[PDB]
Amino acid sequence: DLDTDNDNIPDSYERNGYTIKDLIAVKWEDSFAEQGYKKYVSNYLESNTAGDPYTDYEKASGSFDKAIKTEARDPLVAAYPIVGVGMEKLIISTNEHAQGKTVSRATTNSKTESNTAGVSVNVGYQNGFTANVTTNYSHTTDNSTAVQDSNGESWNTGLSINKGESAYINANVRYYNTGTAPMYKVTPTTNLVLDGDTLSTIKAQENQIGNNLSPGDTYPKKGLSPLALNTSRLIPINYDQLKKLDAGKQIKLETTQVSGNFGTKNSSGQIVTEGNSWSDYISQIDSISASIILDTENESYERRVTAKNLQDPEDKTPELTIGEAIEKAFGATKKDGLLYFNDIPIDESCVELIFDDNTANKIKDSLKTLSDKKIYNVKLERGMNILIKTPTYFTNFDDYNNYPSTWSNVNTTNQDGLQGSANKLNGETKIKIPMSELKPYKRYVFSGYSKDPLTSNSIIVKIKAKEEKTDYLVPEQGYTKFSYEFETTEKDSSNIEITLIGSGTTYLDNLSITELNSTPEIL
Amino acid sequence: DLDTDNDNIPDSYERNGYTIKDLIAVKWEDSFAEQGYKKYVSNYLESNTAGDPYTDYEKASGSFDKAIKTEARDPLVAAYPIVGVGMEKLIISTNEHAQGKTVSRATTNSKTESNTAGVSVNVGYQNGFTANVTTNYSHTTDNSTAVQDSNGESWNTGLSINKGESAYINANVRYYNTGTAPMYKVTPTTNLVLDGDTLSTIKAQENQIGNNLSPGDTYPKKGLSPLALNTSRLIPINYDQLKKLDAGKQIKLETTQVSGNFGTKNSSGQIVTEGNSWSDYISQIDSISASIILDTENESYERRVTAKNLQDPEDKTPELTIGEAIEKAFGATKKDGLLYFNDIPIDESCVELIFDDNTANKIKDSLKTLSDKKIYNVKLERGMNILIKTPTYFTNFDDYNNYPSTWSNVNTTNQDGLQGSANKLNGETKIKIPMSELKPYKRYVFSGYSKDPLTSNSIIVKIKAKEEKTDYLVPEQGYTKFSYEFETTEKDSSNIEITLIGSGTTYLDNLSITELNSTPEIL
Amino acid sequence: DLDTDNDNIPDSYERNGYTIKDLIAVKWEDSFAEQGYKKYVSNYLESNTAGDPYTDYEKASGSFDKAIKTEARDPLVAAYPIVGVGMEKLIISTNEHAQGKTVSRATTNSKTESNTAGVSVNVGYQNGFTANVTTNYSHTTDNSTAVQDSNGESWNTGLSINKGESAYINANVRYYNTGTAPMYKVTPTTNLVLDGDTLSTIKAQENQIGNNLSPGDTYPKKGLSPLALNTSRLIPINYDQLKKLDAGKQIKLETTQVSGNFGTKNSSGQIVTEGNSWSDYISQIDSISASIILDTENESYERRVTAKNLQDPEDKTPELTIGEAIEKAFGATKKDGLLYFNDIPIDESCVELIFDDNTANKIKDSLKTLSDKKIYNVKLERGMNILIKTPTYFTNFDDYNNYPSTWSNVNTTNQDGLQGSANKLNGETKIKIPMSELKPYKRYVFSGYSKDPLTSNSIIVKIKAKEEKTDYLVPEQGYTKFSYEFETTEKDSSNIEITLIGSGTTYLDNLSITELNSTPEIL
Ligand SMILES: [Ca+2]
Ligand SMILES: [Ca+2]
Ligand SMILES: [Ca+2]
Ligand SMILES: [Ca+2]
Ligand SMILES: [Ca+2]
Ligand SMILES: [Ca+2]
Ligand SMILES: [Ca+2]
Ligand SMILES: [Ca+2]
Ligand SMILES: [Ca+2]
């Protein structure tokens, strides 16, 4: 009944209960949780919960831009715009205006490549920390390029450079947005950096892209003509960096400064975008919120969620766990003990978790006092980053199985599993996968969980690839997570085999195969 | 009941008790110092205790820009933004448009080099003075570049400059903000100098740095590619300073004018950065407050703290000691006679303290009248500069120890130390520190405390390095600080030996290895 | 109770006493002189008692711009900012772009030299005039250049100019303030004058400095690089003034028009520096107040003080003596008959006094009626000039003794002196001040005081340098002041010795060696 800020919601209704229906507010008592309403938690000392250019009421009632994704309806998630650039096809030509020698290659893009390229994986997880530590960190602003149609052939012999003069570089790019915010006056700048030696900067101005970029969309609408670097003209190169591109290095294409406008609803009609810009709220959002990234193999997402700092009892901001923040940022359905997306389950054992050194140290220090030793029950703190990687293949010996092949010697008849059932081991367990279903020249990690109700039972696991290896595993009464890496090669090679031999008592569950990054090719 | 300024704070409270909770002001009754609540002190004759454009009650209540660091909510420390610029790597090319001969070297930038370069060392420290002096004083505005990847070769061999015509220089620079204040419309003017001779200046304008610079964050957000000086275009060089650069001197950068605005709330809604400027409060802050700089091996900070004019009893402003100023300006947990950060310990006998000549004369005048003979229990006066250097290696034979190796023949079972334990001696004390963990071409100070309740039980020390020496240290009844210096070379040498032997009675404590400056390399 | 001006202070409290506490005026009764309180007097017929744009209550209550030095707190001293430009490095280039024959020399600036460059000395100082007479006056605005690092070589040798065309000049400059006021919007216009001929006018606009120059703070803040004039650009020279610098003349720099703004606190918040100009108050101060310039070996000071016109009984204004005017315009500590700074002594017999011819005539008119024979007890009048030059060396055989070389035959066992003791003489008196501290190509004056309690005891003095001089002196009953002059030469000369021989009865006191100006050099 008491009001502090300039919002219709009372200060008592800004904590421990929040329901918005027919443009008024009513208290939640847990009767209509199935009827399409979710619980909002917000500040009650400040009008603006996060740094987005809206009040808490307008983003909790739908009276804002229709282009904004609906996942930012909760007041702890703000509309933060990100503009990313992807590189698709490359051509090399010896002229400047546009005869000569022109060569063309196709190239795939990887958004979450530089983040996980500095991840070293050990053979054993210490205590309840079921994650890895990266070396460096980066958002999806930068992008990585991998050459697919790379037959053994030097790039020099197709261009005939002798001593000093080198050709030019032309390409096609696409402009995507990974976040819950559009941009209207899109003016980005992008550096084309090859292993540190900067080549050029690209500014696409305004008229070439148009007055909008809706979230989740690019300018080439799905499958159409990609935008080339012809229509600020062409990029040169010298006779020092071509061998670097040929042998080991890949072209980095990263967006540096992003400027634009947006829309706020006026009193009368449709949107306005003239006297307002995205230039002041970058540090207003980025200095109070964390950064949660999710990487499905088809598309990626990033969100920013406000957090709580421990050394300020006067700051009465909402406090969440890790899993609650994931649920509110990404949108999920709560099943019995589990959190689901539309088709991909989300759990501390079903996907992979990546943190930097500060977050890893904070989680290791904060997991001492808890008595459950689970990842999702970690208190949210500001200034940390989470990268969730969805496996490209995952089975849980249950209703979900996306493996293209079928396993051998599978015994579903068990009930002492971490989630449901498990496989009773008696002898061999073998699977093979053809090379065509896996992208060449990458790095894969195969991970799983094991349990043994004996003293000194042991398992051996053989991974047959272009570096085949055999490894030894000694499980105990507790659940043990194992993870082993392997490398792939070109499509003209053999299949990939996964075998494991035991003594006939252990149990296995939660099998996953996940791609991380790309390996250099000898060229 | 009584009021003096245009603020909400009562007059009878404003001295010796001050607490903000739930946007109300209550006195201090020294019973909730453990729940995170803290006290502050403010002048009662003016609304702005410091020189910032925020009132003290507002800047202590949190109703201000949230990107400012949370320890700046102390009203006794003002917000002051500092912009620094420095190289990462350097290139020379003989063409104005970009073939020819091009060389590239990789450098490292350092923040406190010109300040420490005028500091001399001695065998003993007379009286209670536990600090050194510097020839000239500079802030962290200027940066020094050190060239690492450089074997024996002159720049002329890779350039072939004969009589007068020289090549062109280009560099990769970064911009950083080490202070408790952001700025938005950044317009830095930077002189790129070689030992006094200004080669040129650069004006970054707006399109290359961006409309934002968060405090504590560089221009590339954490790890991205460094900006190149290709987007006013190029700067020249002649064949007079090339060999001068070759022999002894290094390129320095300093900014001169930094223009920008500060952000604040409007009457109704969002924040505006239009009708403000960070150019009218620089002198008004610098002519009222002190200057305290801290330099950790990872990062650096500096603050301006207001002081009391002792020769003016009318100016009713609160007074400070040195340790209380450090605690209130940086933010530190106060253990029993101890100031701790999250991991770095600071005390009067664990760090290095640097003043200039005027502060040295003032502290020598004010030290004799004190009955405790310590550095921290000194009243703060305006217009004096303090620098604190945290050593890269430091131990006290206690809970804190981060040496890359382990000390030999340690008898820590003792209590007669400055803080608990001490190193009893019966035989030698040796360490062989390897060069793989130390920066090449540096100057290092070995510092420590010696004490012995005996007549003349002297000790001797031997430092084996590229400049090897032996020294004799005699003890006293008092507690004597011993400091010595040595120099190092490139990474392809043998280990550095520190050996000390006495006669089985002396006590040695608080052993520290720190770095000062860079030596000119012969090339 | 009775009020005249726009101040809360009554007319009676505006005379013979002025104390302020808790923003309330109170009268002086001589019990709180030792508690830091100071006594002022102010006009009671105008709101602005001085020409600075502040009323007496506002300039005495501290509620004004804090960058103004505390010496301007009293109402009888005006806030007058002065911008001076100094030249440090002279480089000559024969091109209009940047290749060519370039020569770079180092040069030191002298601020107050031309005001005292035309002074001549006398053997005896007649009557009670213990000062000197100058031929021209100059502020700290003009500045002179003196070249030290210059071996035997013509400037034409480094340029090889034959008949018709000479090179271009380029300079390194610094900007300083010496006054009790800051200006923000600096507009410096300067002329580079060469012995009556104007070479060029330099206008450094707004962007080469910015809107901040603190008083007493150089634009390169303490130790940084000198600012070159390469950021309106170039200055030519002919083959007529190029040979004039070789023999006798020196390049001089004189600012002509400077304007700025003074910052005023508004009603509610911060300070405004837009609607203002430092052009309507220059003639308000300069046409009323006098001029006092003080020259220390480390810094210079300039102040303007309002005086009394003796031919005006209607003009009711404060009347000041010379010593009280100095004490109010600088801030002084009063020992028993003595005026001291923190360490620099100032007195009628401890420094050098320079007066203009009109001022000397007025003072010599005023000296006859005085019955005390002291120069500091003279009533001030509008439009007179005072220069106080502190000698670089000064002894009095007392608490202050800062000669680097000790005397010979020192007998301090005496008490019939002007202050404290006097040096008893028995035979010769020797001093040998060496090469290592004397600035070259300068002119020095050694002055002293003598008594002799005998009828016809004469003394002899010898000054041995490259230009030696002998002299015979006859002292008298009272205090007699004598002054001698000499010059110096380059580094490769010998040390300078001073001998004085008496006969055992004469008494010598207050020996002061000072520098006056610079001599032309043969080259
Ligand atoms: Ca509210
Ligand atoms: Ca709210
Ligand atoms: Ca299961
Ligand atoms: Ca107050
Ligand atoms: Ca106040
Ligand atoms: Ca200890
Ligand atoms: Ca009055
Ligand atoms: Ca008055
Ligand atoms: Ca005396």
Author numbering:
A (entry chain A), B (entry chain B), C (entry chain C): 218 to 315, 319 to 451, 457 to 748
Sentences from the paper on this structure:
CDT is a member of the Iota family of protein toxins which also consists of two homologous toxins produced by Clostridium perfringens (the Iota toxin) and Clostridium spiroforme (C. spiroforme Transferase, CST). All three Iota toxin family members are assembled from two polypeptide chains termed the “A” subunit (CDTa, Ia, and CSTa) and “B”, subunit (CDTb, Ib, and CSTb). All three B subunits are presumed to contain five domains that are involved in regulation (D1), oligomerization (D2 and D3), and host recognition (D3’ and D4). Once proteolyzed, the mature form of CDTb forms a large heptameric, soluble structure referred to as the prepore which binds one molecule of CDTa to generate the toxic moiety, CDT.
A map of the CDTb trimer was refined to a final resolution of 4.19 Å. Although the nominal resolution of the final map is lower than the initial reconstruction, the final map does not suffer from problems arising from preferred orientation as is apparent in the initial map. The model of the dimer was used as a reference to generate a molecular model of the trimeric intermediate. We note a similar arrangement of Chains A and B within this structure and the presence of a third chain, ‘Chain C’, positioned next to Chain B, opposite of Chain A. As observed in the dimeric structure, the orientations of all three chains are rotated compared to the assembled, symmetric heptamer with an observed rotation of ~40° about the central pseudosymmetry axis between Chains A and B and ~43° between Chains B and C. The interface between Chains A and B and Chains B and C mirror those of the dimeric intermediate and do not indicate the presence of additional recognition elements. Interestingly, a helical pitch is also observed within the trimer wherein Chain C is positioned ~4 Å out of plane when compared to the symmetric structure.
